[PDB]
From a paper:
In order to identify intracellular metalloproteins, we performed yeast two-hybrid screening of the human proteome using CCSdI as bait and found that an uncharacterized protein encoded as open reading frame 123 in chromosome 1 ([name]) interacted specifically with CCSdI. The crystal structure revealed that [name] binds a Zn2+ ion in a tetrahedral coordination with four Cys residues from two CxxC motifs. Instead, the overall folding pattern of [name] and MAL13P1.257 is unique in that it is not observed in any other proteins registered in the protein data bank. [name] is thus expected to perform some tissue-specific functions, but as of now, no definitive conclusions can be drawn on the function of [name].
The phase was successfully determined due to the anomalous signal from a zinc ion in [name], allowing us to solve the crystal structure at a resolution of 2.0 Å. In our crystal structure, [name] appears to sandwich the Zn2+ ion with two loops, each of which contains a CxxC motif. More precisely, the Zn2+ ion is ligated in tetrahedral coordination by four sulfur atoms in Cys33, Cys36, Cys67, and Cys70, with typical Zn2+-S bond lengths ranging from 2.15 to 2.39 Å. In addition, a bond angle (∠S-Zn2+-S) ranges from 100o to 117o, indicating the symmetrical tetrahedral coordination of a Zn2+ ion. Regarding the Zn2+ binding in [name], it should be also noted that [name] was crystallized as a Zn2+-bound form in the crystallization solution at low pH (pH 4.5). The most notable difference is that [name] but not MAL13P1.257 binds a Zn2+ ion. The loop with Cys33 and Cys36 in [name] (colored magenta) is located at similar position to that of MAL13P1.257 (colored light green), but the other loop with Cys67 and Cys70 in [name] moves toward the Zn2+ ion so as to wrap it around. [name] is like a rugby ball in its shape and has characteristic charge distribution on its surface; the zinc-containing side of the protein is positively charged, while the other side concentrates negative charges. We also found the positively charged pocket adjacent to the bound Zn2+ ion.
Residue numbers in the entry: 2 to 160
The structure:
Amino acid sequence: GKIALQLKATLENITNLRPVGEDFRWYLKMKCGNCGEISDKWQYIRLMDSVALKGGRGSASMVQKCKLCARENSIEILSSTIKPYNAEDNENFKTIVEFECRGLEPVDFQPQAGFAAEGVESGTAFSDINLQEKDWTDYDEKAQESVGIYEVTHQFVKC
Ligand SMILES: [Zn+2]
């Protein structure tokens, strides 16, 4: 099964907002599809981490044994599905990544740092944006204007 993570935010003079880097941390809460167990802990997964699965199943970002029912579950970030959140997406949900899930679905998301974006006309780069507080403000010197990302929210959808 594939699950899409959709972001929404209110944008100020900003576009091309996206996760960057192999070490980018997707902080998630995950639910075992066998027994309904949801760990209390935020757990992060990264592209950088990559474990072989058995059969011709390829790879996963994380494999774990559910603590309640003991099933081996896995999740894989699909690198090719990572998409930017752009000025035209303002205030709409948009899929920014997809996960290949084998027995374990993400049910919550805590964005933190490692995002990047760009001034919409200036093209000035804003690197390592931390969205943990769901609101972010900076100033674009070239464009002589404020930039911001506000009211960040998310949802998961089947895909
Ligand atoms: Zn379980």
